[PDB]
């Protein structure tokens, strides 16, 4: 809709760093978690969404650090290009969508096992 909150927040002030946000490629079938260091990201609520390389909604977890940052963990069961959409109080960061690649690590312990 035309009408919008237009609060006092800036997603551009959100920094994305960690293994989960590895541009070089992360090992699929393994629990990975990144860290969103945002100080002046605004007085809103951070949101994270991951869509498998097939086009389906995944399960992601978000934690509050309080030290001006945040932490998120997820387990990319499937492999390929994952679409991670990060929005702040209704403002998609200038980095999203985050194009991440998941490489198959063949055998993976303490992870997703189907039989």
């Amino acid at each position: 809709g035309s009408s919008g909150s237009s609060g006092a927040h800036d997603a551009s002030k959100v920094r994305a760093s960690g293994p989960g946000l590895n541009a070089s490629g992360i090992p699929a079938s393994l629990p990975v978690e990144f860290t969103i260091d945002a100080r002046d990201a605004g007085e809103g609520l951070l949101t994270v969404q991951i869509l498998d390389p097939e086009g389906k909604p995944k399960k992601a977890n978000i934690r509050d650090n309080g030290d001006g940052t945040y932490t998120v963990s997820y387990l990319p069961d499937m492999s390929g290009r994952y679409t991670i959409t990060i929005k702040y109080g209704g403002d998609e960061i200038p980095y999203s969508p985050f194009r991440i690649h998941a490489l198959p690590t063949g055998d993976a312990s303490s992870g997703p096992s189907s039989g």
Side-chain angles (χ1 to χ4, degrees):
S2 56
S3 306
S5 290
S6 278
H9 58 271
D10 275 68
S12 65
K13 305 285 202 89
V14 179
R15 270 281 294 163
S17 60
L21 301 176
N22 190 55
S24 274
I26 63 156
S29 306
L30 181 89
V32 71
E33 52 150 83
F34 46 104
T35 300
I36 308 280
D37 316 64
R39 303 94 78 74
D40 282 30
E43 202 159 274
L45 81 89
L46 168 87
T47 65
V48 179
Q49 184 150 347
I50 313 168
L51 299 191
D52 27 270
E54 294 283 25
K56 316 286 181 181
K58 293 291 291 208
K59 204 80 77 65
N61 308 264
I62 307 151
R63 174 150 171 166
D64 59 85
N65 271 282
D67 175 55
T69 66
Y70 306 74
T71 302
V72 178
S73 67
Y74 73 93
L75 176 90
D77 206 271
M78 282 278 149
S79 51
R81 205 178 287 286
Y82 276 79
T83 309
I84 305 170
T85 311
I86 304 170
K87 281 187 206 271
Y88 201 82
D91 270 55
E92 181 208 274
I93 48 164
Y95 295 71
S96 149
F98 269 121
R99 297 160 183 276
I100 311 298
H101 210 123
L103 317 170
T105 51
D107 303 59
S109 191
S110 295
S113 70
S114 203

